[PDB]
Write a protein that binds this ligand. Structure first.
Ligand SMILES: NC(=O)c1ccc[n+]([C@@H]2O[C@H](COP(=O)([O-])OP(=O)(O)OC[C@H]3O[C@@H](n4cnc5c(N)ncnc54)[C@H](O)[C@@H]3O)[C@@H](O)[C@H]2O)c1
Ligand SMILES: NC(=O)c1ccc[n+]([C@@H]2O[C@H](COP(=O)([O-])OP(=O)(O)OC[C@H]3O[C@@H](n4cnc5c(N)ncnc54)[C@H](O)[C@@H]3O)[C@@H](O)[C@H]2O)c1
Lengths: 332, 332
């Protein structure tokens, strides 16, 4: 019937799902809150395609129970095409889409806000106020505009962050391996990551989790940095050696750290550990420091992003199902 | 004894004070951390001028006492003059200066950051992360670029607030009783406040505490604002009817409120109440709301601001004392 079955649908997604349905009243759309598992495939039996979103791997077993239920078209509401048993997929002739770009501003705004907060010592101030210590001193702020902001990576997110930081009046330098000519005209780029580290008050990372960048922030890069540097990371956990940032924080060289991602987040992030034994003492410690901001991989999480995740996933699924060129197919 | 006596000097001001003294060795400077009241006025005795900074009112009695000690020259380190008894000051031929522009950015950045935090539900997020609830859902954010931002007052701070909000990509509209040509050429201005209230997702006030402005944010203007409006006040408490905002919050109309200032802050703000009986249950309640951000009149509290507040104040005071033209004189 042109029946799209969706898994893992969240409450906050429903509004964009309804919307999608109202623009495609001829399409039958069903969904569950459950994740896609070899036992949950049977739920999409009848559907022409499934829209999915979950870190729970896409196990061959799973893909297989899907095809055995007649489904071979899959639309990711996210970017990641990682937990997908790819050899299996190609085997069953799986057609797969994802959502590569939903809202770059979501992540860039989060980085921007978290940096500014750390500069302002807003967390120390919030903590004082919550205990009813309303004295100013000694929690004096640092203006964003008084900073040199170093952006590592000038892709979709990095450029929006630069945009935002320039709006504040900060002096913005950048570093990327491939210089976008427009930015190159402008003069943003510096020649070496080292030039960035020596002059930036604020460093933000907008670079992929590639092996050459793993732990690029470490004891050696931190030792190059300016006194009172602020580091922001909303890209990928493994970019940063947490123990070296903790060292930097402890020696007083690192002014503060904002992280939305963490090298040990898998299995920790996106779980309620209230009233339970927190699994990672190091993360627990970071969460409590006055000059560190931990968010559980939430930089993407905005009404705008979520809107685009839903709608675009359903646009791609319908396109797969209607034998149309998919907008954002995954190279299988 | 070309002498200047400074009140309410804080540790964080001292560095700036010595920089000033080191450039004006022929001037004698004395200071106290205490506030300027009728009973501390006596400490100015001998000085030729006075440099002050306080939210506590400069009463007719304080002003009389200053004079009755030889002082008729007063340089505030800050912008606002709303707590000075002008009628008494004029009667006594007081000469008064302020520091109109110590750093419009400090306050503007504070406003932008608090507004963004509220849009992001960052407080709700931070409280569950501190509890160790690392689930992002359902705490979804609102991007700054998705908002219509309404700036009430396009003076020194409002203009920098506009800049910042535009850097984020938000649609910025404005309302000032006095229009800035350069601004007006761009078509930022709306014809009335009611127009601004009707269109704005985010409202920020950047106007002085003048009689006509008291309680401009009240049950009647809130009724006119959009659903889920975010209100920011870093200017002056009395601009906002606090109970009205609380009703706006309780009715679900107002998405959140950022306040740096408060009707009743004098004697509360910049005081430690930890382990004491909090004097203002209404303020304690605001402080603990998830969608209210309270700072104790710290919008100004940045290193860039505090230097300028000190240096320009003394510049101004020297000028008064030496019968030269003050750079930023106030009208009495
Ligand atoms: N925290 C979240 O919620 C969230 C949400 C979405 C994406 N992300 C992350 O954000 C990152 C940014 O995504 P994007 O869409 O901007 O990617 P992109 O491909 O558009 O940007 C990557 C850029 O980094 C540059 N680069 C690579 N290695 C570099 C190095 N060593 N030094 C300097 N520059 C380098 C590339 O040349 C490229 O310009 C992603 O890698 C992803 O992991 C996080
Ligand atoms: N919280 C803090 O630390 C802090 C620091 C500095 C200033 N402030 C407050 O912010 C105010 C603004 O400072 P600024 O430097 O921008 O002053 P400014 O004089 O440059 O700007 C005030 C502007 O408001 C306009 N205006 C006055 N009443 C208005 C009304 N009813 N509607 C619309 N526009 C109106 C004036 O025309 C002017 O453009 C100061 O008076 C002070 O009360 C607070």
């Amino acid at each position: 019937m042109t029946k799209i079955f969706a898994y893992a649908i969240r409450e906050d997604e429903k509004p964009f799902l309804k919307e999608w349905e109202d623009a495609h009243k001829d399409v039958e759309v069903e969904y569950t809150d459950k994740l896609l598992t070899p036992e949950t495939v049977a739920l999409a039996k009848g559907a022409d395609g499934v829209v999915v979103y979950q870190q729970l791997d896409y196990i061959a077993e799973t893909l297989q129970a899907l095809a055995d239920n007649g489904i071979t078209k899959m639309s990711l509401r996210n970017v990641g095409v990682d937990n997908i048993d790819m050899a299996k997929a190609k085997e069953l002739g799986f057609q797969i889409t994802n959502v590569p770009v939903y809202s770059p501003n979501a992540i860039a705004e989060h980085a921007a806000i978290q940096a500014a907060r750390i500069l302002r010592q807003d967390k120390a101030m919030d903590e004082k106020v919550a205990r009813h210590d309303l004295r100013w001193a000694p929690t004096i702020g640092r203006e964003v505009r008084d900073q040199v902001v170093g952006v590592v990576g000038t892709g979709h997110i990095g450029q929006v962050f630069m945009q935002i930081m320039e709006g504040f009046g900060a002096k913005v330098i950048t570093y990327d391996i491939f210089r976008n000519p427009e930015l190159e005209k402008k003069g943003y780029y510096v020649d070496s990551l080292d030039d960035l580290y020596k002059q930036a008050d604020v460093i933000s990372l907008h670079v992929p989790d590639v092996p050459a960048n793993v732990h690029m922030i470490n004891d050696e890069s931190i030792a190059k940095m300016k006194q009172d540097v602020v580091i922001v990371n909303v890209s990928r956990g493994p970019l940063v050696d947490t123990d070296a940032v903790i060292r930097g924080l402890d020696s007083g060289k690192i002014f503060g750290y904002a992280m939305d991602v963490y090298e040990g987040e898998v299995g920790i992030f996106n779980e309620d550990w209230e009233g339970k034994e927190f699994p990672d003492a190091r993360l627990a410690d970071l969460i409590a420091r006055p000059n560190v901001l931990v968010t559980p991989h939430t930089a993407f999480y905005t009404t705008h992003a979520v809107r685009n995740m839903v709608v675009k996933a359903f646009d791609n699924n319908l396109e797969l199902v209607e034998g149309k060129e998919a907008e954002t197919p995954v190279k299988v």
